[PDB]
């Protein structure tokens, strides 16, 4: 009743539980305003750490051949899975692989050229995301006949164009600046 010893207990307790519920409410609002989707596969190595989401490459291509030839533990393991996975995770056409990703409900990963990946990323219906860095490093080049008289000038030309920034800007033009998909996902929660 009038006992103060119990009063200070009920007061320190009320203060405590009020602090807890206020913190809870605050962080709940913080978690509610923020829309952040958990990335299923963050890294190329991460794909090896899960036995549920299948992943594949092209049947006859440089990708498959690279995974075959590579002695890196991760990539070798991936190759061991892909060659040993049933049904086959290899697809006949590139569009087949993409379609397999789109009809999978997120249950299939596709390994392909960085260029093609981000190009498909910028085309409708914009449901395919490119994740992680590249697993190797190759490049496209301009082909000329053996010992041709056009070789050196187009080589120095490629270099010069590369240094002026023409190539990069041009790539941005045909990949991004013409993008049908728009800019990016909504990080600003709407409604």
């Amino acid at each position: 009743p009038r006992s103060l010893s119990a009063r200070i207990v009920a007061g320190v307790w009320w203060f405590f539980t009020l602090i807890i519920i206020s913190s809870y409410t605050a962080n709940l609002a913080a978690f509610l305003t923020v829309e952040r989707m958990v990335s299923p596969i963050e890294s190329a190595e991460d794909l090896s750490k899960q036995t549920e989401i299948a992943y594949g490459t092209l049947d006859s291509g440089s990708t498959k051949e690279f995974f075959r030839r590579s002695k890196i533990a991760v990539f070798d393991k991936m190759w061991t899975y892909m060659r040993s996975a049933e049904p086959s995770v290899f697809v006949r056409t590139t569009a087949e692989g993409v379609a397999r990703v789109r009809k999978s409900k997120g249950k299939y990963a596709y390994l392909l050229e960085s260029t093609m990946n981000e190009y498909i990323e910028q085309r409708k219906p914009c449901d395919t995301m490119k994740v992680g860095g590249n697993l190797d490093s190759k490049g496209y080049g301009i082909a000329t006949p053996k010992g041709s008289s056009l070789g050196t000038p187009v080589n120095l030309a490629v270099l010069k164009l590369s240094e002026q920034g023409v190539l990069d800007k041009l790539k941005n033009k045909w990949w991004y600046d013409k993008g049908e998909c728009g800019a990016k996902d909504s990080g600003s929660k709407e409604k």
Binding site: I19, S23, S137, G139, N155, L156, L159, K160, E163
Partner: protein, 146 residues
């Protein structure tokens, strides 16, 4: 004669170099690459460190070249195996192989390295003066109540 430059971790000193002699004095990426390239191309190679320790470049006044490019053009070396950036100005005076490593300009920032030390979260949102104040209001109504 394979010319290169001491740059970590491309070409390094084992620190035991005083005891050794030859290509066993140098260790790194480009050393191993030089070994494999020589093994596939079929020649014996000798690693030599460039005298000025600076990569290729050309002065407008003298018109001459310095560095590994200097050692290649003026015939002081046979091949340059090192992290040498391929530019137009070099492909005019030397023959570049296809790139063996692709790279670009990236941004480095100090890592977060954060594990929350704060021993009291609750005093962060409200100012300390505000808590002192609310204590003064508590006693201030307490005296009235008494």
């Amino acid at each position: 004669v394979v010319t290169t430059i001491l740059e970590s971790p491309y070409v390094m000193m084992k620190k035991n170099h005083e005891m050794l002699e030859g290509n066993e004095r140098y260790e790194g990426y480009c050393v191993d690459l030089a070994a494999e390239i020589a093994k596939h191309c079929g020649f014996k190679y000798k690693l030599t460190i460039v005298g000025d320790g600076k990569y290729g470049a050309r002065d407008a006044d003298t018109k001459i070249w310095n560095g590994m490019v200097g050692e290649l053009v003026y015939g002081k070396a046979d091949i340059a195996i090192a992290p040498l950036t391929i530019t137009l100005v070099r492909e005019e005076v030397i023959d570049f192989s296809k790139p063996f490593m692709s790279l670009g300009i990236s941004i480095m920032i100090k890592k977060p390295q954060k594990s929350k030390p704060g021993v009291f979260s609750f005093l962060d949102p409200l100012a300390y003066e505000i808590w002192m104040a609310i204590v003064f209001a508590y006693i201030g109504v307490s005296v009235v109540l008494f």
